[PDB]
Amino acid sequence: ESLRAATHDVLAGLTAREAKVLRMRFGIDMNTDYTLEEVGKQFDVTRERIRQIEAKALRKLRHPSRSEVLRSFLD
Amino acid sequence: SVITVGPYLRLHQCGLPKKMALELFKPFIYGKLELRGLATTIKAAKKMVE
């Protein structure tokens, strides 16, 4: 429960459509996950750019002080 | 556990071992630890109790 709350607020901390991308790529707060091509169709930009978005978001969250609170969930 | 007298008590109280106190109130302890921020998350609270 704590993890879902924290991940939701930290996603809220990031940009809008990137956040929606990351929610859709996974099952975060949503049902079955669609593969990259289908989400790209969802934005109508359907290609490697979507994984470019994924990698850029991951890179952007790599920076500490935001994820360390979530780092705690590792053990 | 086994009971013992301990006369100095007030009528409305009872002597309770620490270690049982931790064992019983574990979740209350976790709650307070997380509220005051002494522990970042529940898992760290558990390690801090142990």
Curated annotation (Swiss-Prot), chain A:
Residues 47-62 are annotated as: Interaction with anti-sigma factors. Residues 36-55 bind DNA. The record marks 25 as: Interaction with anti-sigma factors. Residues 10-63 are annotated as: Sigma-70 factor domain-4. Changing residue 59 to D/E: 2-fold reduction in activation of class II Crp-dependent promoters. It is found in: Cytoplasm. Belongs to the sigma-70 factor family. RpoD/SigA subfamily. Contains 4 domains, connected by flexible linkers. In the active conformation, the domains are in an extended conformation, each making extensive interactions with the RNA polymerase catalytic core. Interacts transiently with the RNA polymerase catalytic core formed by RpoA, RpoB, RpoC and RpoZ (2 alpha, 1 beta, 1 beta' and 1 omega subunit) to form the RNA polymerase holoenzyme that can initiate transcription. Identified in a complex containing RpoD, the RNA polymerase subunits RpoA, RpoB and RpoZ, CRP and DNA. Interacts with Rsd; this prevents interaction with the RNA polymerase catalytic core and with promoter DNA, and as a consequence, promotes transcription from promoters that require alternative sigma factors. Sigma factors are initiation factors that promote the attachment of RNA polymerase to specific initiation sites and are then released. This sigma factor is the primary sigma factor during exponential growth. Preferentially transcribes genes associated with fast growth, such as ribosomal operons, other protein-synthesis related genes, rRNA- and tRNA-encoding genes and prfB. This is RNA polymerase sigma factor RpoD. It comes from Escherichia coli (strain K12). The chain holds residues 538 to 612 of 613 of the full protein.
Swiss-Prot record, chain B:
Acetylated on several lysine residues in the presence of glucose. The RNAP catalytic core consists of 2 alpha, 1 beta, 1 beta' and 1 omega subunit. When a sigma factor is associated with the core the holoenzyme is formed, which can initiate transcription. The rRNA transcription and antitermination complex (rrnTAC) consists of RNAP, NusA, NusB, NusE (rpsJ), NusG, SubB, ribosomal protein S4, DNA and precursor rRNA; S4 is more flexible than other subunits. It comes from Escherichia coli (strain K12). Signal peptide: none annotated. Co-administration of salinamide and rifampicin or salinamide and myxopyronin suppresses the emergence of resistance to both antibiotics. Belongs to the RNA polymerase beta' chain family. This is DNA-directed RNA polymerase subunit beta'. The chain holds residues 353 to 402 of 1407 of the full protein. DNA-dependent RNA polymerase (RNAP) catalyzes the transcription of DNA into RNA using the four ribonucleoside triphosphates as substrates.
